[PDB]
């Protein structure tokens, strides 16, 4: 399995043309702060194709 390549799963707004996102901040699904830790309504936007 090749876990090197990754894609993005969650984002607040759609990317503008010819734009790149390098931000890795924890996506806030709910209203409580994520506090930089994975948890409820808090998922890492980067996923692995594998």
């Amino acid at each position: 399995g090749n876990y090197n390549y990754l894609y993005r799963l969650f984002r607040k707004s759609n990317l503008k043309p010819f734009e790149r996102d390098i931000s890795t901040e924890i996506y806030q699904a709910g209203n409580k702060p994520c506090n930089g830790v994975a948890g409820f309504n808090c998922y890492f936007p980067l996923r692995s194709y594998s």
């Binding site: 503008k16 010819f18 734009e19 790149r20």
Partner: protein, 44 residues
């Protein structure tokens, strides 16, 4: 794209007309919202 036009002249802004020629293009691809100016202090 980041495009910069400029003009220079030896002189409240004065009353006159002068067009600006393009001189810089930079293929950046960035989201810009804010900026700042940089000074050069004269040390005693």
């Amino acid at each position: 794209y980041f495009k910069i036009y400029s003009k220079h002249t030896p002189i409240d802004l004065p009353q006159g007309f002068s067009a600006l020629e393009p001189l810089v293009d930079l293929p950046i691809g960035i989201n810009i919202t804010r900026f700042q100016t940089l000074l050069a202090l004269h040390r005693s």
